[PDB]
Amino acid sequence: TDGGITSFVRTVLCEGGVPQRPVIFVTRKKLVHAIQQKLWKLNGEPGWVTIYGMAGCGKSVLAAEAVRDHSLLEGCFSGGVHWVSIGKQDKSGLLMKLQNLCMRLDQEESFSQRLPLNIEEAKDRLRVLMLRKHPRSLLILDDVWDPWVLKAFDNQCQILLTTRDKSVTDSVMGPKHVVPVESGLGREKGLEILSLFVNMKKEDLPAEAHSIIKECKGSPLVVSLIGALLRDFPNRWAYYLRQLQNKQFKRIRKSSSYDYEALDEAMSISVEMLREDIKDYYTDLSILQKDVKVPTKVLCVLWDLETEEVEDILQEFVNKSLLFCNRNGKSFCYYLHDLQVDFLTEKNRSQLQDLHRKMVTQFQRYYQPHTLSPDQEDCMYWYNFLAYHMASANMHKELCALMFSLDWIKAKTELVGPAHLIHEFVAYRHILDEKDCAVCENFQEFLSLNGHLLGRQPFPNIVQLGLCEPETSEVYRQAKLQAKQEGDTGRLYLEWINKKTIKNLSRLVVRPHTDAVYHACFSQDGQRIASCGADKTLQVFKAETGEKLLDIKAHEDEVLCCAFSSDDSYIATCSADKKVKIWDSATGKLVHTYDEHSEQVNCCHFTNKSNHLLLATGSNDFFLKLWDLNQKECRNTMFGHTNSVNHCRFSPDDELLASCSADGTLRLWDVRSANERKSINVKRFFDVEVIVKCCSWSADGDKIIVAAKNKVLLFDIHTSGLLAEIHTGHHSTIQYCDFSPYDHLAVIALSQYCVELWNIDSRLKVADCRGHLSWVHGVMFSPDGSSFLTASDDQTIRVWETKKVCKNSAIVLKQEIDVVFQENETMVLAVDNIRGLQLIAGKTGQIDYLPEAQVSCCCLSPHLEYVAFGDEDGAIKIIELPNNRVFSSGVGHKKAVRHIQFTADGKTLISSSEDSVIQVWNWQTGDYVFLQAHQETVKDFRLLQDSRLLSWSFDGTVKVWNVITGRIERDFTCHQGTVLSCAISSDATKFSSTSADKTAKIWSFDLLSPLHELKGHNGCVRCSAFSLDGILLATGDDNGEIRIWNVSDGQLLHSCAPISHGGWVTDVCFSPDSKTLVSAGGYLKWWNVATGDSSQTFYTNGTNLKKIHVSPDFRTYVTVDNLGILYILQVLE
Ligand SMILES: Nc1ncnc2c1ncn2[C@@H]1O[C@H](COP(=O)(O)OP(=O)(O)O)[C@@H](O)[C@H]1O
């Protein structure tokens, strides 16, 4: 003990949160220095300095000491040090930590307010604050347990960690050091501690002294604890040596209790000597978890006391080394050494539940779940632990009542995201929703769909989101009522009416993982399903009900794939730990492991024939391996791939092994000899590198399908010919697929939660499977191909039945639709996502299908009775509804048909395509009027007053044709490039403005020049509308911007346009009242004329909307997102 401090060192250390010396301190200069050395041996270059050793040997104390020396601080870590206490943590654990470390480093919000909402984000937000804002700083990781935790700090920093396992760094790259600390000190130093505690000097130290140290195994933690006794009870020296002698401590699980012995004893004793009043307070600390510094306030409510008092009480404990604590800034928080938490938990075992119940009880006697303001020292403790205690006390009614509440969700998510809660629901499911209710799933699904929204600023009206759930959901009822209980307050909640129809409701949905699901598959008889994800476990459940069957902890790192053997007798799993494992599918007992791959093994499939029993594995190490489960050894190692082997399947006729890799090849090895028979280079891309993934065989084993970037390809196993090439979801990359055994069906997880099954041979999409709003990693058919499963990042696994999914339906449409608001109801005609078009009557299912050669655009004749449509090949057809059959085909159009509309009257059909003519087919007669704009291409058009028609091409030109007399009355050149949209002033028509990459020039039809150029937008206008007379013209920006302008030749009124939109702003529309402006782009969003927006609500699952259909009453809306979901909203009662 002494002084190396410098007031500088002080501040730097107090800032980084570095705990300060113990009650009694004894230098260990020999080691302190050794560490420091390893620290300079870092230089300026990032690295790792590890201090390892048995618990309580002093590792923490040592660390804090190393950075307590100006000489080392300045000129080395000039930027300071940051102490992060971590301990044993799971994914949610580490987030709670990182979140905290982030509230610390960005105290000013130098780079965004709000904490990170997940580990991945957090890691990033940190790699910045550390490589600027805090450059040349030392990070202190205290008590690291798993290697993956360091993998989040592995961002070019200089880190000094403490750990019991000297192997937590085996999973990290970078220069690494080590500094072993002996389990215990030396009799001299040991004696020193006691010497300093009792107040003597080794000389006057009783005989037992040299003998006591021997019992405390030289462990500082233990020694201090005892030295604390001998101090508070100066006579009983030989007495205590005796107690320490015979460890009278009896803990269940007798067995091999290491560090316990000595510690348990010292603890048992010291605690027993606590005054008969503060004795029950310490017992209460048996619910204080390992690695969790508790703020004072917590205990005040626990013990119905007040700040000062509590602190004194707890100060007594700290004085005996029964409790530790450090400054969090004025307010104090107290922790416990991991070893003591174990002591207390073992001792007071049978009271734990009650102690947990005592907490919560005192939390309710003082707070409300959704009331705690973010200024309370204990604010955090409650959010991330209130749920814990309730369940640790096994309180159904209490817990349920907290989780099954939007207020809690809203309150918490807004503070820490939905990450944690999504975990809680899985964890506490058992004690949570049981009975017969599904109120759990409801909230469980609720968090899936909107998880992406919750926590993100601006915090989304939780009531709205809840209104978009099934009527039959608690989430809905809670939100609905939350609404009505406010009826009239300048809000108005839109209410998705056809919410019912949409939602491809899958026959079954399973939630058994706490992290992303990477792969899942059916048992050979299809009765069961096994799924393995990033949560490190192997899971199995009945295919029929999701009824959990097995919950194994398969690996020590993410599980990339899993499969069943030919007789479902086994299940293998291969993971990132580079191991492969075999399990008894019945009992789940490990039936041996095979570690031989260098890198992570991705592929693992068994032989199909019930005869032989082999396992094939592909790995990032470029090899493939055949294992003979009937042998403790590998059987073959196929060398050959140029890159990572991503997939492999045995042929039905077990003689061949197909293999798929990143080296751009498909390959057929010969099982019986592990020899490469063929290799098929994938060269269908325009030298570029391509990765092939999923790759299954045909029924006869004579064909193989594979996926590469945007395509699925069918090869002839023999000739090696490409028998087919279907192009998938435009331009993205197929993440996974699976070929059925019938109907040449193929299911592929397109790109990001999009799932569509195609028909090879027909080379056409058959169905759109909408079920996830988070990445889909895997997907596959049951063995009879009667159904398929979906595995995703939203950590769910859903089972679908093919038949039901492939049936044609109005659940998913294209964005080409037309609506007719006819008072008593709404009517939507839409181009089906696969074949024809649907006559959807909102406010009633009444969906009527009309098949057709895949139309390209729709059209409704006011009065219904007739519907018209565009064609890919240019065809035009009117169908008459009253009959629903007899139609007509008016010849014309080269390119595919774009816009298409009926005349005011039911006769004549104006239509445009991708060329410069506008067909005016006055059907019924057979007459035609052509408008050779001679432009380049008619961008679009729209009917006008009396048989007059406004038209704009992307040549800056806008014309005013006359139907009946294809005569260009007016012709303007209002822009030097594509005219994107433009509307009329409706009222009168004195005005009709444009918008076109640049600004929004507004005019009057007459003056062959614009009234005034509005060069406001920086992104480029894409839409606009005139106030229903009013005197305003709102314009849509290509960058979510949207300025309001005034009908007065040219000005620049208020630019209400945040983003802190969600991509583009493809539409606007003033309200009759000329006060509320409705907007649509990445989502709908209402505003308030003249500064400030409004009901910024309604987030649609999908984005990139186009044209929002408001109605007369401005109390009904219809739209369609790129997810093909039909939104028919309508202001609440
Ligand atoms: N050098 C020391 N001098 C005095 N007490 C010490 C010393 N080292 C450790 N201790 C005691 O042990 C405790 C710190 O233990 P710690 O270092 O955190 O164990 P671990 O290294 O396994 O995390 C303190 O409460 C203190 O009383």
Side-chain angles (χ1 to χ4, degrees):
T1 311
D2 237 301
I5 299 179
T6 63
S7 182
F8 159 61
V9 182
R10 287 187 181 183
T11 306
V12 161
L13 287 199
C14 182
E15 283 293 350
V18 188
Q20 67 303 321
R21 282 165 176 185
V23 177
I24 297 315
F25 174 61
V26 304
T27 86
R28 303 177 73 175
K29 72 309 286 196
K30 334 88 55 188
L31 279 175
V32 195
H33 178 279
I35 305 173
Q36 284 167 157
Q37 288 300 92
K38 288 283 179 172
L39 275 188
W40 290 91
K41 202 168 194 291
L42 280 169
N43 302 312
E45 277 183 49
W48 309 95
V49 173
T50 294
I51 291 171
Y52 72 99
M54 180 157 255
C57 61
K59 310 187 299 297
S60 304
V61 165
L62 284 163
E65 266 292 309
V67 307
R68 194 181 305 259
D69 185 54
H70 188 167
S71 306
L72 175 54
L73 265 182
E74 167 194 296
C76 213
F77 304 123
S78 318
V81 311
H82 291 93
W83 181 288
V84 182
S85 284
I86 298 179
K88 179 65 175 185
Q89 303 295 6
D90 57 347
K91 209 68 91 56
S92 280
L94 190 62
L95 181 46
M96 286 181 255
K97 291 295 184 189
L98 296 168
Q99 298 188 311
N100 190 71
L101 175 60
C102 275
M103 289 176 265
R104 291 215 282 128
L105 294 175
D106 256 314
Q107 197 150 172
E108 263 70 55
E109 301 160 357
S110 300
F111 300 102
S112 190
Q113 187 186 186
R114 192 201 78 189
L115 327 73
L117 309 197
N118 61 66
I119 301 68
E120 298 71 58
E121 173 162 1
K123 175 193 178 66
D124 208 84
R125 182 91 78 71
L126 186 94
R127 191 219 67 281
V128 146
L129 307 180
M130 290 293 96
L131 314 178
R132 187 198 299 170
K133 175 56 174 298
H134 297 308
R136 189 71 61 56
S137 293
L138 177 64
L139 245 60
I140 309 176
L141 304 178
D142 193 43
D143 198 49
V144 180
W145 284 68
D146 301 335
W148 62 267
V149 180
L150 260 39
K151 280 188 67 180
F153 290 117
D154 186 56
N155 315 321
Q156 298 171 297
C157 307
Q158 287 180 294
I159 314 176
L160 160 62
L161 76 167
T162 58
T163 186
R164 297 178 206 179
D165 183 323
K166 73 159 166 65
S167 84
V168 281
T169 65
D170 289 2
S171 176
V172 63
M173 177 68 254
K176 44 167 62 66
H177 296 288
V178 288
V179 174
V181 182
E182 311 80 6
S183 301
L185 307 181
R187 314 95 308 179
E188 271 303 317
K189 273 295 178 182
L191 277 156
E192 209 195 313
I193 297 181
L194 295 174
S195 171
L196 272 162
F197 248 122
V198 293
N199 218 307
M200 301 182 134
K201 56 190 297 179
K202 310 218 181 68
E203 316 308 67
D204 208 90
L205 271 194
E208 303 74 42
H210 215 299
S211 211
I212 284 182
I213 299 299
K214 194 162 77 177
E215 292 308 302
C216 308
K217 281 201 160 55
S219 177
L221 183 61
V222 189
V223 177
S224 302
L225 264 183
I226 296 306
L229 267 178
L230 305 187
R231 180 196 65 188
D232 303 323
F233 298 100
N235 279 36
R236 26 239 275 185
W237 272 71
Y239 174 66
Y240 288 129
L241 172 57
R242 197 173 309 297
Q243 311 301 47
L244 276 168
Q245 302 279 197
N246 31 288
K247 285 74 173 181
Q248 189 144 170
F249 199 76
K250 306 291 192 162
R251 62 157 53 247
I252 197 172
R253 292 182 179 296
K254 187 65 197 312
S255 302
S256 185
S257 294
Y258 302 93
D259 41 62
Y260 290 164
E261 301 283 72
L263 183 87
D264 283 2
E265 216 57 42
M267 280 295 312
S268 186
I269 300 181
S270 205
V271 184
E272 160 75 310
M273 280 293 97
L274 295 178
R275 175 167 49 281
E276 282 303 297
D277 64 359
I278 71 167
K279 216 169 185 180
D280 287 351
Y281 283 159
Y282 198 65
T283 303
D284 275 348
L285 296 197
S286 291
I287 63 185
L288 185 172
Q289 320 165 61
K290 285 181 172 71
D291 322 294
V292 180
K293 296 174 158 65
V294 197
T296 315
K297 195 81 174 66
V298 181
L299 300 166
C300 303
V301 0
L302 208 209
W303 306 315
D304 299 299
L305 304 184
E306 269 316 309
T307 323
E308 309 73 49
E309 296 180 1
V310 186
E311 294 159 85
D312 295 324
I313 288 178
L314 301 172
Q315 184 56 288
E316 291 201 59
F317 300 133
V318 180
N319 230 50
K320 313 173 86 68
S321 298
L322 285 171
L323 189 71
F324 307 160
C325 89
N326 78 318
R327 47 168 59 177
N328 182 189
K330 214 301 163 292
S331 166
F332 284 165
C333 50
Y334 309 82
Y335 52 119
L336 230 37
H337 179 291
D338 282 10
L339 279 175
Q340 318 191 181
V341 170
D342 265 320
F343 171 76
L344 295 175
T345 294
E346 178 61 76
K347 171 164 176 294
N348 306 164
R349 176 83 62 185
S350 62
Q351 260 196 300
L352 299 190
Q353 170 170 308
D354 294 297
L355 301 187
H356 277 304
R357 171 187 292 281
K358 173 179 184 173
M359 188 79 93
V360 331
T361 276
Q362 294 296 300
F363 168 90
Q364 289 173 154
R365 194 185 196 75
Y366 288 59
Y367 315 117
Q368 266 71 65
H370 61 285
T371 300
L372 7 69
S373 305
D375 72 3
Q376 307 178 184
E377 320 165 354
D378 57 327
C379 199
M380 287 297 275
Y381 182 98
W382 290 127
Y383 273 128
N384 58 35
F385 290 127
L386 174 54
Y388 168 63
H389 293 294
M390 282 193 229
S392 291
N394 199 283
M395 299 176 94
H396 317 295
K397 293 192 171 64
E398 292 64 33
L399 186 59
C400 288
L402 171 77
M403 313 233 97
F404 294 173
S405 159
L406 278 170
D407 286 292
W408 181 228
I409 312 295
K410 180 181 191 307
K412 197 182 181 176
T413 52
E414 288 191 58
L415 235 200
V416 277
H420 195 197
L421 266 165
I422 294 168
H423 188 175
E424 303 202 291
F425 273 105
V426 179
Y428 316 132
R429 168 75 95 67
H430 58 270
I431 153 70
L432 203 32
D433 185 73
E434 292 294 42
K435 315 174 185 299
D436 199 6
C437 44
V439 183
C440 202
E441 257 294 308
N442 297 184
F443 278 84
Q444 197 123 53
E445 248 302 299
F446 175 83
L447 288 175
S448 281
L449 309 199
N450 306 74
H452 58 92
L453 286 180
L454 290 57
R456 218 75 57 170
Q457 273 242 260
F459 313 124
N461 176 93
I462 186 74
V463 200
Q464 184 65 88
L465 305 182
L467 287 178
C468 323
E469 293 299 305
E471 304 296 310
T472 190
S473 170
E474 234 306 321
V475 186
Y476 178 63
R477 303 177 306 183
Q478 265 186 50
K480 219 309 185 57
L481 233 189
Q482 224 104 74
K484 293 182 62 182
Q485 288 177 177
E486 183 192 7
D488 280 301
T489 35
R491 278 193 158 293
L492 308 170
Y493 281 156
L494 304 185
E495 173 146 48
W496 196 6
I497 290 186
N498 67 311
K499 70 170 60 167
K500 201 180 297 181
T501 30
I502 313 295
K503 188 186 186 187
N504 214 308
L505 277 314
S506 55
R507 195 260 301 165
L508 179 59
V509 46
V510 189
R511 237 170 297 241
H513 297 277
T514 64
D515 208 340
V517 176
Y518 289 148
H519 178 69
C521 70
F522 288 96
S523 63
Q524 296 304 58
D525 57 39
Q527 284 310 70
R528 292 173 292 161
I529 295 182
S531 52
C532 44
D535 85 354
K536 307 170 181 69
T537 95
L538 189 231
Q539 288 268 359
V540 185
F541 41 94
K542 310 178 87 70
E544 272 279 302
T545 47
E547 203 185 302
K548 288 204 186 182
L549 289 180
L550 302 190
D551 185 312
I552 296 156
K553 313 180 181 172
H555 295 60
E556 63 209 80
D557 194 2
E558 318 199 323
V559 193
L560 313 177
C561 177
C562 33
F564 282 95
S565 64
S566 57
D567 69 306
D568 294 322
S569 187
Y570 299 112
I571 298 179
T573 60
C574 48
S575 95
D577 59 23
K578 312 160 299 177
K579 296 186 186 64
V580 188
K581 291 180 181 180
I582 314 305
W583 316 76
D584 179 317
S585 69
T587 52
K589 264 53 188 160
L590 216 199
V591 184
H592 193 219
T593 106
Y594 299 101
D595 192 323
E596 292 206 4
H597 273 295
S598 302
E599 306 308 339
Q600 63 188 298
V601 16
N602 323 283
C603 177
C604 45
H605 178 246
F606 277 94
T607 57
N608 319 97
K609 266 192 171 57
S610 47
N611 189 69
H612 28 183
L613 209 159
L614 308 179
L615 207 222
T617 68
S619 175
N620 265 62
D621 75 21
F622 301 30
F623 304 132
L624 262 166
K625 285 189 190 299
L626 291 183
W627 314 81
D628 194 326
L629 298 215
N630 318 280
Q631 166 185 162
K632 309 183 192 300
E633 249 288 303
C634 173
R635 137 153 174 174
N636 276 288
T637 307
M638 269 94 64
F639 163 75
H641 272 295
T642 293
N643 206 335
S644 287
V645 180
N646 298 104
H647 194 281
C648 63
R649 284 286 161 62
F650 272 112
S651 58
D653 184 13
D654 269 330
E655 307 173 311
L656 289 191
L657 201 193
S659 142
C660 310
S661 172
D663 60 30
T665 78
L666 185 239
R667 310 212 182 185
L668 318 177
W669 272 271
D670 174 342
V671 185
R672 201 190 294 280
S673 65
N675 289 160
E676 196 182 324
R677 293 277 287 297
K678 290 152 76 76
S679 170
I680 302 214
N681 154 66
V682 178
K683 73 275 185 180
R684 300 62 171 36
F685 311 92
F686 345 103
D687 289 345
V688 192
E689 166 232 349
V690 171
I691 309 184
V692 309
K693 283 172 271 46
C694 144
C695 68
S696 41
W697 300 74
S698 54
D700 46 356
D702 296 299
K703 274 168 255 71
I704 216 170
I705 65 163
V706 281
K709 312 189 77 166
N710 277 314
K711 323 168 184 177
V712 172
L713 282 24
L714 186 50
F715 287 101
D716 188 335
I717 180 203
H718 303 288
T719 74
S720 307
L722 172 56
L723 280 51
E725 168 181 4
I726 75 176
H727 312 289
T728 205
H730 275 72
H731 303 60
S732 61
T733 72
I734 295 179
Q735 16 217 75
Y736 203 71
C737 67
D738 199 37
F739 194 29
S740 196
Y742 303 107
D743 292 273
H744 326 308
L745 261 176
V747 176
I748 82 172
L750 178 47
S751 196
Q752 267 214 297
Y753 52 84
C754 286
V755 184
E756 27 185 288
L757 33 173
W758 287 64
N759 187 169
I760 312 301
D761 135 306
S762 141
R763 314 203 320 173
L764 286 176
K765 184 206 285 181
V766 175
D768 275 310
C769 179
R770 228 243 56 176
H772 308 268
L773 276 184
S774 306
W775 203 278
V776 171
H777 291 288
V779 91
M780 73 173 41
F781 287 109
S782 54
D784 64 349
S786 83
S787 58
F788 63 97
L789 65 79
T790 311
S792 95
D793 212 270
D794 75 356
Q795 45 201 262
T796 68
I797 304 156
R798 311 187 186 204
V799 175
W800 313 77
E801 51 184 300
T802 308
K803 178 214 64 180
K804 184 183 187 296
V805 178
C806 295
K807 283 179 66 177
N808 179 93
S809 57
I811 122 171
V812 199
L813 302 346
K814 303 206 183 186
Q815 290 182 291
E816 252 306 301
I817 69 145
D818 186 41
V819 176
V820 168
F821 299 121
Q822 49 171 45
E823 311 318 295
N824 47 95
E825 190 184 60
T826 296
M827 286 290 171
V828 195
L829 209 203
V831 184
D832 171 61
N833 59 137
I834 302 297
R835 226 162 84 215
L837 25 70
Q838 318 280 329
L839 196 298
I840 300 163
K843 167 51 190 175
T844 288
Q846 275 294 298
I847 255 44
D848 301 292
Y849 185 57
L850 297 164
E852 210 68 61
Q854 224 302 285
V855 337
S856 70
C857 58
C858 219
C859 188
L860 260 179
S861 65
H863 277 58
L864 274 55
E865 100 214 79
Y866 303 135
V867 308
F869 55 93
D871 175 289
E872 223 65 49
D873 294 277
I876 303 285
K877 296 183 198 170
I878 281 196
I879 288 170
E880 60 164 357
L881 300 179
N883 124 62
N884 253 64
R885 308 184 304 170
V886 170
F887 60 53
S888 314
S889 298
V891 189
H893 271 132
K894 304 139 297 298
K895 270 56 172 58
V897 182
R898 259 61 285 304
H899 196 174
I900 167 180
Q901 177 185 2
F902 271 105
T903 316
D905 52 275
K907 297 164 266 58
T908 311
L909 262 172
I910 300 74
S911 62
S912 129
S913 57
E914 303 185 301
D915 95 300
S916 69
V917 51
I918 299 183
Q919 273 199 36
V920 181
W921 172 46
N922 184 160
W923 77 290
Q924 262 212 301
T925 55
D927 299 317
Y928 285 87
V929 190
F930 304 111
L931 311 167
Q932 248 76 312
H934 207 60
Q935 303 166 306
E936 203 297 278
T937 292
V938 181
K939 203 300 180 310
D940 205 56
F941 70 76
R942 97 137 314 195
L943 260 57
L944 192 33
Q945 278 299 54
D946 291 298
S947 296
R948 46 191 301 198
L949 169 160
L950 189 46
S951 147
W952 22 289
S953 79
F954 47 36
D955 298 83
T957 48
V958 175
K959 298 187 178 64
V960 186
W961 313 76
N962 185 307
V963 178
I964 322 157
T965 309
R967 184 177 60 87
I968 299 176
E969 300 181 354
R970 273 297 173 182
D971 177 12
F972 320 95
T973 288
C974 25
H975 289 284
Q976 293 290 300
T978 298
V979 177
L980 315 153
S981 167
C982 80
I984 70 173
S985 73
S986 164
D987 323 68
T989 184
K990 177 56 178 177
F991 313 105
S992 81
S993 191
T994 88
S995 45
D997 168 87
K998 176 206 306 69
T999 93
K1001 304 179 186 175
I1002 178 286
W1003 17 258
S1004 71
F1005 283 160
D1006 287 53
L1007 308 71
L1008 286 185
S1009 204
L1011 302 197
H1012 210 68
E1013 193 174 63
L1014 317 179
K1015 313 189 73 60
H1017 299 287
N1018 305 304
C1020 113
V1021 199
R1022 184 159 290 293
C1023 72
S1024 62
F1026 286 98
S1027 23
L1028 204 295
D1029 223 355
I1031 192 92
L1032 302 308
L1033 187 278
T1035 51
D1037 184 59
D1038 186 283
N1039 292 321
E1041 189 170 4
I1042 156 187
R1043 304 136 182 284
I1044 300 298
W1045 308 72
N1046 54 310
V1047 177
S1048 293
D1049 300 304
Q1051 283 85 172
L1052 307 82
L1053 216 155
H1054 197 45
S1055 171
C1056 261
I1059 208 175
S1060 309
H1061 215 89
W1064 275 316
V1065 180
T1066 74
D1067 201 31
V1068 291
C1069 168
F1070 291 84
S1071 170
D1073 60 69
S1074 196
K1075 303 181 172 180
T1076 305
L1077 173 69
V1078 68
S1079 177
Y1083 52 81
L1084 309 180
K1085 186 179 179 187
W1086 294 27
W1087 312 66
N1088 162 69
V1089 288
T1091 331
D1093 63 294
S1094 175
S1095 186
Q1096 27 77 183
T1097 54
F1098 226 95
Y1099 279 106
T1100 50
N1101 301 185
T1103 22
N1104 303 59
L1105 303 171
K1106 344 105 134 300
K1107 219 310 96 60
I1108 174 66
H1109 297 321
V1110 314
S1111 72
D1113 66 356
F1114 197 73
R1115 194 160 313 298
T1116 312
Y1117 302 66
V1118 179
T1119 191
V1120 176
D1121 52 11
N1122 43 14
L1123 275 173
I1125 295 162
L1126 199 247
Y1127 294 91
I1128 295 183
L1129 322 178
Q1130 180 157 295
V1131 185
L1132 230 182
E1133 67 185 67

